[PDB]
A and B are shown apart, each in its own frame.
Chain A
Amino acid sequence: QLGHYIHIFVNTQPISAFERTLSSKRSSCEYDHFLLLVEWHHDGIVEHVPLDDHMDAQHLLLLITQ
């Protein structure tokens, strides 16, 4: 328009409220750990949009900017 961008990565969300509240059976104490990331930028804000296939290339460029 004159950067203005989204870096893409990997996330973690440990929280004890689900973590050790079960643990040692159907909730592993470790994960350990990694997910997904898509950070909107420019200016002064970062969307944390859900990241789930099925997906198309256009969406992050579009829907976010929509």
Chain B
Amino acid sequence: TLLRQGIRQLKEKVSKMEPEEMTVKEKKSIIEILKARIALKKAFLKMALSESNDTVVKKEDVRESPVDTFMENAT
């Protein structure tokens, strides 16, 4: 989530090969602590896994089939 924008944003935060780097990059390491605990935000699994969750989807794609059929029996 925050990590997703955080990749593209930590991207060009780097400033040349000069010691201009670490003067900001130590605080960036603090940001790395912060994101290290952002990993804790995603510490547990919800629905199983792709594609096993996708298998659940296709399972619904079979489960949708009766739904499109029994109405034909309305009369």
| Residues 37 to 60 of chain B near chain A (Cβ within 8 Å) | 48-49, 52-53, 55-56, 59
Which secondary structure characterizes the binding site on chain B?
helix
Residues of the A chain whose Cβ atoms lie less than 8 Å from the Cβ of B56: 17, 21
Chain B interface bracket (under 10, 10 to 19, 20 to 34, 35 or more): under 10
Q: Give the A interface residue count (CB, 8 A).
A: 4
In the complex, per-residue mask of A1-41: 1 if CB is within 8 Å of any chain B CB, else 0:
00000000000000011000110000000000000000000
Residues of the B chain whose Cβ atoms lie less than 8 Å from the Cβ of A22: 59, 63
Measured CA separation A16–B52 after assembly (Å) = 10
Measured CA separation A21–B54 after assembly (Å) = 11
Interface, chain A (partner B; CB < 8 A): 16-17, 21-22
